[PDB]
Design a protein around this ligand. Structure first.
Ligand SMILES: [Au+]
Ligand SMILES: [Au+]
Ligand SMILES: [Au+]
Ligand SMILES: [Au+]
Ligand SMILES: [Au+]
Ligand SMILES: [Au+]
Ligand SMILES: [Au+]
Ligand SMILES: [Au+]
Ligand SMILES: [Au+]
Ligand SMILES: [Au+]
Lengths: 394, 371, 394, 371, 394
């Protein structure tokens, strides 16, 4: 059988160094010259290591300088190969993943050799068996010892990190663009929802995130003159609206006396600016096209998805809440970006996918009057907890 | 035996575009799935690509050219060279949206010619009651096409106004002039209304008492379907409503000799009206449409009323959706009776839905909500 | 493949018209000339339609008269075929079922054509797809539109029906043959169980139908001199009897003082006339042969089966309480007929089969002292509810 | 390798008769089933015929000649022509009763030669404890034959009289002269008696106390089978009944030195009697018959007593029926002990059945019922 | 096919008679001359039967004497075969098992013939079938009638047996070797655990057998100078010990004042003599080798296994608590024997295997202060119940 390797991947990391020296940092972190399958490659990696070792930076000439001293330059294929090697990278960025699979392939390559060694050490080495017992046992435990990935990121950095995070919490206002709820919260804490951002509010039983999401919705509709597209695939259009009216100005089984108070609410939304859509279990695809058409005609602002799960962009096997929900997640992110607006997606719990790694800001809601929003992730911003009184619907 | 509707020019445009930009794959996956691709290779590739993304890793052509390597489909797909060929097929890489879209269009086609022709082979061989395969056929087509704008809320408010106009200050005509008529301006036109009653002594009465009003008191027609009981059972029950006779017969042997008059008067009143009944235990989606369709092209149609682990709750939705589809398909107002032991996806397709002396409450709308 | 048709069935309905004109009524109800597969047949059907249209009745000559005007008479095969067509019917009665399967075959025949049309409309018609989407969707919805079976049997007829049903309830006595329980009930309401009739009393928890059935049993044994064969496959012979004694003259854990009162009962049955059989889960076949032998020797009267389910005439797959219980049901009917006596079969509930369509009279028992028998079906008789006091055993 | 017991002359008589009258099929089905028919075609036909009837439709030769068409077995069975041939085979059509009967007789035969020969091939190859295949063999024969008159009630009253004669005013001899002896005139002869006791501290005592009386006090013999406990365990328990010794041993070390006398006297009384015990944990249908049969042809036999999802409750019935069959097969009166946690089909085969200071109640009869 | 027989087995039982006459007793019990497959064999068995019938004992010459009168001696193969037949037995002891399988083979042999007779009686005998119905039914019931195994071992012998068992209970002391608990119990009742014996104490919920077993353990360690190896695979070494200390001299969550009282206990075991092992789910194999090594070095005495189930000597399929637990059971027996010491194995309940047939003494524990040990089996000894006060740990 053909031994486990990927000369193409090797070429990728290898040539990625030429493209940038930062590459050789990440590459050497995981890999070691001889850890390359193609002989030439191990030399070209060792050579760039010894040449980047002396202090002198790594250029297409530098690496062929050290490489010339041993005169392996004719062996590796010449500077012709060196250059080709620089073309064979699709993007020096994410060199780690290229190195990764080279670390993997040739790691696994030894697995094969070490075991086959045990097989032979079996047929001939019959003399004493209790020795092999623990012997072949540790040889495999040794093959799991050479995977260089893993570093305890100390405890010192996370201390200074928690500090400049409070120092980042110690600043003045200046909401850049978004203008949400009671300032202290989202607005102040993170300049009111930036553009291209994917936001995630995590609910729980009795989803208050619905009310909270639509409050942010109208507030960004009444206050600013921005158009907020809101996909409520759970509840009906008309339902959402009235729920929003009693929300902004005070019931169910009633005969009202203060119709006016309901008119004050009714009028309040006269500025409008919110385009609401409720068609259930909507394909994420249509979330994009519909949402975008609005932008090109009237102009957007921000989009709110009422229940992140109900989307279920279709396709292949479900695979226990993870696979499809993740491809939908990064579909929202790629969307918020190619739409240049924030997008608040609502979730809840009973690792609900990969949404975390896609989210720019993830926020949870806690309590039991008063309820507090505790934001966990906030790429480029602080951490945080902030409370807003809640009562019945506001 | 002719050539299938093949996409490859547009397919290669998608597989190529992916290798150029990560966002490319996200938008390809946005509408189509590997199974969709036509070329054997194009599928394996687009799938591999997806497993890499799924894996959490980045996708441009090495990760995938090495994933493709694993479970060895590489030499099978066409080698790295072919993969390269993909990348060069297209310069820029943003028009995948429309280019990929083409891949889907042609997929639906082969998806349709496959499901249609599936119906053909089904006919020639399986005689398992034409009622079913003729019906199952309509479902397989619905299954292929629908599944592979925004709303005016200043407008939705309009609906909230017209709504409130009713709440304080006729189009299909319901019972007496009580809260029910204004509650729905009649209780009319091509929409579905579900009236839900728990085991409340069989609140079927409310259902036919109205059906009666529509025919006898209104002068319109009504098609009632009793799948549980018999016809005579209910028409005798209708009379209990007309002559308010402390209900039953046997009261004096054959009937009450003195109250015999009300029988002839109640039967006389009811006779001049037009109600069309039908009791065919278990039957309601297909023939109901066919019978009402036949009745409509005849006299004109009525307001219709129906009475009453993974292969059960889904089946109820399909008919719930069909009862609604039947309404618009026949510009008729069909009110169905459900039970409460929710019971499926009724509140979704349903239009004004109502749950049930005592009083009644109105649920989601087309008109003024709860009262 | 050979297109779905049954020329034999066609010949059946077609020729069934010659045998009787009533046939052409039922046939035309479902079928339409061209709805015939064999061309000739459609002509011979159209021709008899146009000739029965003008007013003039349909005879073998009439139909060949109209058929001659267009001179298709040589085409259809001549009057030779017309006559043969009249022989090819096994029984002009149940022409509907022959027409039915012709309606079915050629219905389904279009299904094939319409779909194959969609298949072709697929390969060539690529221009616009959203149109086909709804297009092929309605073409199949159109094939389900041509099945002519179904008529709302109005509401007027069922009104006059409920009337002459009360007028049928307004009559005098005159029990024809059977003489059962308290007159007002079965006796009056339906002249006391007619001959050849299949009767069905529907029980429920705590089967009172057992007591009720055996009361009718002795009453038809003590009163008239008829022989009532009673199959009690549930309880033992001796058990039934004593239960019947305390039934007719008043205990379980006792030492009696009024042995006489038990003798009065014991004597009461001296007339006897009831031949009781209890061998459990008896094959319906043996119910017939045994029951019949008695008739040919001593002479019958009526038969009572204690529990209709326990019979389970054996054979093929069970198929959820329906298949075998139905073939047993129509086996009792074919029996009561070929035995010329009534047969009361007892049932209960927790569509228990097809028994309803086989039963000549189906009666239910209701209450909670007093209990009422409510009869539902009664072919040739009224509808009805009648009550009889019940107490403990009478 | 010779010719099977073939029915076709009589078969064609049935398949033909059906086409002549609907009632014909009802009477054919009355005793036989398609699987029964011999000719490949004759089966398919009779089955098709049955599915049409089952379908609810009428059966004479078009419905079936078209059903046969569906799932295409028509050209396979022999064509319409053959079917016609069936109809003409017989003029009148009422003697199907006896004509079809012949079809069944010959079916049983091939049904038997098949099950018998099945036993042969079973012997030559599977040595899985002869106890079982020799036993399983007897069951497969019982399975083939029994399953493929009325009663005199003036007579049944006779039984009710003789019964009452006892109720107020010996044949196998039971316990003392209490209500038990008259309750069953002894408690004798070739019948099965089930005495049922719930977890009532192991009411086995009642069972052997009687068994003792039969042997020691009666002078007859008795075969007792204890499958739970050991022999010595019970004979020591028997002595507890004889010398009414506040039960156990150890009372003084070895025993009570003063009451040592009762031991020799109780053991002396018991010794002269004839009781035959046997403890072979789990064993009761087959060897019990074989052991009692051997004992009977020897000394004469006794009154015998036994002590104690879909593949469990049915197995109990088969032995319950066997215990009863054992009684008549050996003109012996066998009383078995059951538990109450009913427990199967015991009340069906059982003859006088009884459930269990306190008192006892008698259940269904051969004699005076409950007291 | 080759008819079911085992000429070798036949030779076994047959020749086993020559080896010992006791053999002919057991053999004739089950077998009958013609019940032999090989003709010769049936003669040689009949001949030894008629010759052992006349009174004269059976020797190689006696059996060839009777055999000569009919002059079948040349037919059976001569006295050469007779002698060979005496060599063909592997051990005249357990002749029953050899006879057994001959009884079996040729029993089953008739099964075949009788059925094949029914098969033929099927093809030709069509005349009347109800007769065959019950006929072939009894012929098979007849084949189950000839298996000669089974004898009610009367009721007389078990009476005299229960007597000399009390007379065996009426004796004096003299503990042979073992010296256990409160004399009255094990010690007196059975001379204190004999050598080579397999003992089994049956526990139940809340295993007191643990405490009881270790009490016997120390008592045989403190009192006599014997070495008791105890395998406690349930609890830890140290745990067992302290539990044993509070056992011999009086807590858990405590701070003790009478450390001395614990020293008195601590000292008590100074004599020691108990080698405790706790390594869990120990292979029975290692129970043997370890246990034996101790014997050859220091010398044993008795072994205690804490929980008989937890052993689970491994191998093939489990087969519902029976197969493997039985091969382990007879492994302990073969061990206690090849170790010449008693072995107390502890069990409990919720036929737990075949342990009973392997055990030399099986004892149960009963109660609810006082608790009684009731011994059931005791090969070579009496039966018995004996009580010992128990309190908390002693
Ligand atoms: Au809200
Ligand atoms: Au509201
Ligand atoms: Au009503
Ligand atoms: Au009424
Ligand atoms: Au009764
Ligand atoms: Au009674
Ligand atoms: Au006893
Ligand atoms: Au005792
Ligand atoms: Au202890
Ligand atoms: Au302790």
């Amino acid at each position: 059988r053909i031994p486990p390797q990927s000369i193409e991947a090797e070429q990728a990391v290898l040539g990625a160094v030429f493209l940038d020296p930062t590459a050789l940092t990440l590459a050497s972190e995981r890999l070691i010259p001889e850890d390359f399958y193609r002989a030439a490659h191990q030399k070209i990696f060792h050579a760039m290591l010894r040449v980047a070792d002396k202090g002198e930076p790594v250029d297409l000439v530098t690496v062929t300088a050290e490489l010339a001293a041993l005169e392996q330059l004719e062996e590796v294929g010449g500077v012709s190969y060196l250059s080709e090697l620089a073309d064979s990278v699709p993007t020096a960025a994410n060199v780690e993943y290229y190195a990764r699979i080279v670390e993997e392939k040739s790691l696994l390559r030894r697995l094969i050799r070490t075991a086959t060694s045990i097989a032979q050490d079996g047929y001939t080495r019959e003399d004493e068996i209790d020795v092999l017992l623990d012997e072949a046992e540790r040889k495999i435990m040794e093959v799991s010892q050479r995977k260089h990935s893993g570093a305890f990121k100390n405890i010192k950095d996370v201390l200074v990190q928690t500090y400049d995070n409070i120092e980042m919490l110690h600043n003045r206002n200046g909401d850049i663009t978004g203008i949400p709820t009671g300032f202290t919260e989202l607005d102040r804490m993170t300049s009111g929802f930036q553009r291209s951002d994917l936001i995630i509010v995590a609910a729980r039983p009795s989803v208050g995130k619905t009310a909270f999401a639509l409050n942010i919705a109208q507030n960004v509709a009444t206050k600013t003159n921005e158009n907020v597209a809101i996909f409520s695939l759970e509840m009906s259009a008309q339902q959402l609206v009235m729920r929003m009216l009693c929300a902004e100005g005070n019931t169910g089984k009633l005969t009202p006396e203060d119709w006016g108070k309901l008119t004050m609410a009714m009028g309040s939304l006269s500025n409008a600016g919110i385009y609401i859509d409720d068609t259930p279990s909507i394909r994420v695809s249509d979330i994009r096209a519909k949402c975008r058409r609005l932008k090109q005609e009237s102009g957007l602002g921000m989009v709110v998805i009422d229940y992140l799960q109900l989307i279920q962009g279709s396709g292949r096997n479900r695979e226990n809440r993870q696979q499809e929900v993740s491809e939908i997640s990064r579909s929202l992110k790629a969307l918020a970006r190619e739409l240049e607006v924030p997008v608040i997606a609502l979730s809840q719990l009973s690792e609900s996918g990969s949404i975390e790694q896609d989210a720019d800001i993830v926020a949870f809601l806690y309590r039991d009057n008063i309820i507090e929003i505790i934001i966990a992730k906030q790429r480029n911003g602080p951490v945080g907890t902030v409370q807003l009184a809640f009562i019945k619907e506001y």
